[PDB]
């Protein structure tokens, strides 16, 4: 359960600056995705049926954990049976104290099918730092500055769930403005 | 009446169709008509154009809704609120938003000087008045030219 | 007959399940006149075996 | 964005009438798509780069005034990597002895694209960002010496006069 | 190399700002054309390959076309931000993210909606992270063992639950009948139909007969006057 | 050259309402805008016009 | 495929969990007039095969 | 972090309560594993003696 | 002082051959969590007028301490900390003072 | 640890406090002894996430 540093080299375009980060041991869930909560159907009756759309209210549940140990199968192979004393660490940040991730268009949604098991990402961020130079070389490393934030999630209390535990987080959006699901049969130019 | 705007708005479009200026003058209002999305076809091979209606087209028939028949001697009256909105102040200013400043001390801030990449700053006198420092900018300007140097 | 005869299948031993929660506990809360720290560790205790 | 991920986005890859996209790798980072822009920058160049110089506005290049320090959504001095940077339209609060001058350092602005010389390409080249739709970006950093208000010149509109160039909160009805 | 809107410090270091302000589009059908912007996106491709984009038909009616210019009597493509605007958001589609979170920097302009698509949020839906507990192998009696942690996994159900406000349609006065809500068209087939590929003359045999629309599907069929 | 940008800290006088000015223009119903009080013609943007 | 694929880890069986508390209650509890000694021992009975 | 605020903020530190808390205790049997090493399981009779 | 250890269990005895006496190879983990309350004094007052001097974190013998960094991007020679490092003066707070 | 809230530095010596500058090699003794940072004094110095 390392932390590690993610720290690649800089010397084609770079980004302005070497990028400097940490990664966790821990998982995160991403579901930012409209087509995870409507089948194809349901998306074409949302459509049809209204004029705007806007979020209003979240609920995730964690339900059905197991934590499965894993041993060595007679004549090879391994076999996994369930853990009464395996623990699932469950963190919800509320407080936006660990930097956020979520909403970057990254590959790391939810399954579209809901036959397709998640594979939650690994948590990792970036943060500020100083560039210092490589010696003669003259390429460059984002090493860490005493902005640098480098977060310890194991230093904040979190539940420790057991098999068949379940957990919920639940969150309200604030007053947003509603997609119009409908166009316009004029040009504002020729009113 | 449409207070339900069910149909394309053409008035406030500076167009020739106001009320007569004076009382004496009959008033003869204009004939509705507005425009509407379409698709352009091109017109065989001469590859001029014209706009085709298209599915999103919108064709208003006003004889579908209900409206009043009012006979000779007949009144109907509309009633509309404005929503609240910004007045149009009718007083001037009697000052530049740049000059208001007192114009009889220097700034404590003071501007460059000698440029590049090791800049000196100069203290501004009471006289230097185009360089005073603004808090605030002028607003924006877009192709804002005369018929001239248009 | 194996398990392994399906090529996308692993054994299972049907272990128990316990439903527990359970808080990892850890931080400092401060207040004008105190600090609360909380800690934790897992601990390990070796087998002796006389 | 979490580094260890490429994007479920595609960009432009082969262009032209046809183009063609391709997927992000998690090491391609300068072109990670981004949901917010930065702010706007006008000449937000440095000294080097940059009678009356700087951001000015007038009828012709002998009749002009200042804009200076220009808008507070724009450094004018900072530390950056390895230099000092001092903007063209730097006001400066009194000179260590004519001198070098005394400025903020702006360093909330340069992490933010904010900083001086920060060119924007518009596949050309400038300085100049303007306000786009879902812009994001810091203002000038209050500071000891900063004046506390300035008086909003009550003209008929404004846009986010909140904070007043020089420092400080812009108000309609300032301190009598 | 970084093509499309970009900044930085110099040609060799940049970031991308695709896919730029959602007051402007990135794809759509011109009338004769699909035409296609640097700073667009794609969600996927259809196979490298073609892009997947919204088909920004409702910012194209409202001179926000891709490659409109703009003339000041000279030629430029960038209109600056005038005061009495009004323009179109890029269209919600069915696979946008749903939030970002806004940045909290002192200030912003219109981040109520990310570039990405969905809603700009200071305190989006918070991040719930999940790890395993490691659990200590055995130490004792027993040689050689060193430090060891049990072989452990975990599994589970994610149930999501989002409510979504929906406004009413919008009263229809026309006669003629509005356009049809169609559902997006697949590059072969059909979309999110499990068909058998070998049926059909279509090449996305790739897809397995489970196929995505090669637009995104975008509402905004229906359409009411200014 | 003659552009100048929206900054920050703008501020600026409107044209002046005048006699034969019109009253209002429908500001039309797209999705967003910025400072559509006022119509280019004279008078008040409004959303809801007189009908 | 095999556990030991992995050098610092071993393998698990998952068993059960029991939360009791018991006491080993040992010691002797003078007073004026007694005192109460308690003794405690592990006991084993073995496997009798017939 | 914490330290950093304690010694920023405050004029004196005192000791004055101490809560200890031994939870999720398991005792582990131990046995060997197929294919050789050894594996381990929860004991439901296994104890741990706290003093 | 709390005092731990794994309760000894005999291992079998009875009809199996040689089996000798044997203790149960068990060991125990679990978790302990310490909840310590401190009284906290308030700061005296200052009635300076220059600043108080800085509340400095303590300095590493390389790079910075309390931070997890790459040692490879960094000319500090603490390499065998593989880029944690405490500092190499113990951190003792009293950086503002007060007259007598 | 958050970044230090250091007080500004000065051209000469320290900036707020009276010195005598004929104990120090700074070159400011056109200030007399008292100073000004050569920096204005902006705060900020601690940071968090976005």
Not at chain 3, 15 to 33: H, I, Q
Not at chain 5, 44 to 53: A, D, E, L, P, S
Request: include cysteine.
């Amino acid at each position: 359960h390392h932390y590690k540093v993610f720290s690649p080299a800089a010397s084609k375009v770079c980004t302005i600056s070497p990028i400097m980060g940490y990664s966790t041991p821990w998982r995160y869930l991403d579901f930012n995705a409209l087509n995870l909560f409507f089948s194809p159907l349901e998306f074409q009756h949302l459509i049809e049926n209204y004029g705007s759309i806007a979020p209003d209210a979240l609920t995730v549940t964690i339900s059905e954990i197991a934590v499965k140990d894993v041993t060595d199968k007679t004549g090879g192979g391994v076999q996994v049976t369930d853990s009464t004393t395996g623990r699932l660490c469950m963190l919800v940040d509320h407080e936006y104290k660990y930097p956020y991730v979520l909403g970057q268009g990254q590959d790391t949604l939810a399954p579209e099918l809901p036959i397709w098991v998640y594979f939650p990402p690994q948590y990792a961020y970036l943060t500020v730092g100083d560039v210092n130079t490589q010696g003669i070389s003259g390429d460059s490393k984002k090493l860490a500055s005493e902005e640098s934030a480098f977060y310890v999630l194991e230093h904040s209390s979190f539940q420790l769930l057991g098999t068949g535990g379940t957990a919920t987080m639940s969150y309200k959006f604030p007053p947003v403005p509603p997609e119009n699901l409908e166009g316009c049969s004029q040009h504002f130019y020729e009113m | 009446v449409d207070h339900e705007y069910k149909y394309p708005y053409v008035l406030g479009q500076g167009q020739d169709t106001l009320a007569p200026e004076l009382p004496i003058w009959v008033y003869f209002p204009p004939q509705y008509a507005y425009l509407t999305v379409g698709d352009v076809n091109t017109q065989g091979i001469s590859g001029d154009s014209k706009k085709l209606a298209s599915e999103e087209s919108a064709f208003y028939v006003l004889e579908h809704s209900s409206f009043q028949l009012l006979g000779t001697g007949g009144t109907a009256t509309m009633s509309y609120k404005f929503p609240p909105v910004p007045p149009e102040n009718l007083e001037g200013c009697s000052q530049h938003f740049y000059e208001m400043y007192n114009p009889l001390y220097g700034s404590r801030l003071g501007v460059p000087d000698t440029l590049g990449g090791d800049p000196k700053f100069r203290s501004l006198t009471h006289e230097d008045h185009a360089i005073q420092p603004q808090n605030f900018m002028p607003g924006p300007l877009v192709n804002s030219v005369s018929t001239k140097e248009g | 007959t194996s398990v392994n005869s399906a090529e996308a299948s692993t054994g299972a031993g049907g272990g128990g399940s316990n439903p527990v929660k359970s808080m990892w506990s850890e931080g400092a809360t401060f207040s004008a006149n105190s600090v609360t720290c909380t800690f934790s560790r897992q601990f390990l205790i070796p087998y002796d075996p006389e | 964005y979490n580094p260890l991920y490429g994007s479920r986005l595609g960009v432009p890859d082969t262009l032209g009438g046809d183009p063609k996209f391709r997927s992000l790798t998690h090491e391609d980072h300068a072109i990670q798509p981004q949901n917010f822009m930065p702010g706007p920058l006008v000449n937000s160049v440095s000294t080097k780069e940059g009678a009356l110089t700087g951001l000015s506005t007038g009828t012709s290049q002998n009749t002009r005034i200042s804009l200076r320090p220009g808008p507070v959504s724009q450094p004018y001095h900072h530390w950056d990597t390895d230099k000092y940077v001092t903007g063209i339209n730097a006001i400066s609060h009194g000179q260590t002895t004519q001198g070098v001058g005394r400025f903020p350092n702006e360093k909330e602005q340069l992490k933010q694209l904010q900083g001086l010389n920060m060119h924007t390409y518009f596949p050309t080249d400038q300085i100049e960002r303007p306000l786009m739709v879902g812009s994001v970006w810091n203002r000038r950093a209050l500071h000891y010496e900063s004046q506390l208000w300035s008086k909003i010149p009550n003209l008929d509109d404004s846009f986010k006069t909140q904070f007043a160039a020089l420092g400080g909160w812009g108000l309609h009805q300032p301190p009598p | 190399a970084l093509t499309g809107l970009s900044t930085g410090t110099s040609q060799n270091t940049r970031i991308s700002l695709r896919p730029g302000p959602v007051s402007q589009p990135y794809h759509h059908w011109d009338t004769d054309k699909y035409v296609t912007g640097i700073n667009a996106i794609s969600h996927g491709q259809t196979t490298q390959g073609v892009g997947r984009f919204p088909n920004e038909k409702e910012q194209l009616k409202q001179l926000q076309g891709l490659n409109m210019h703009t003339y000041f009597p000279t030629d430029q493509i960038e209109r600056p931000l005038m005061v009495g605007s009004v323009w179109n958001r890029r269209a919600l589609h069915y696979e946008s993210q749903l939030w970002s979170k806004i940045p909290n920097l002192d200030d912003s302009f219109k981040t109520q909606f990310a570039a990405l698509g969905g809603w700009g949020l200071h305190q989006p839906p918070p991040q719930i992270f999940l790890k395993i507990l490691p659990q200590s192998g055995p130490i004792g009696g027993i040689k050689s063992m060193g430090i060891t942690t049990l072989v452990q996994y975990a599994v589970g159900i994610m149930t999501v639950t989002m409510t979504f406000k929906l406004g009413p349609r919008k009263a229809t006065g026309r006669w003629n009948p509005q356009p049809g809500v169609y559902p997006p068209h697949a590059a072969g087939h059909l979309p999110y139909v499990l068909y058998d590929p070998t049926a059909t003359d279509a090449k996305q045999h790739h897809r397995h007969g489970y196929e995505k629309p090669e637009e995104l599907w975008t509402a905004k069929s229906r359409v009411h006057p200014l």
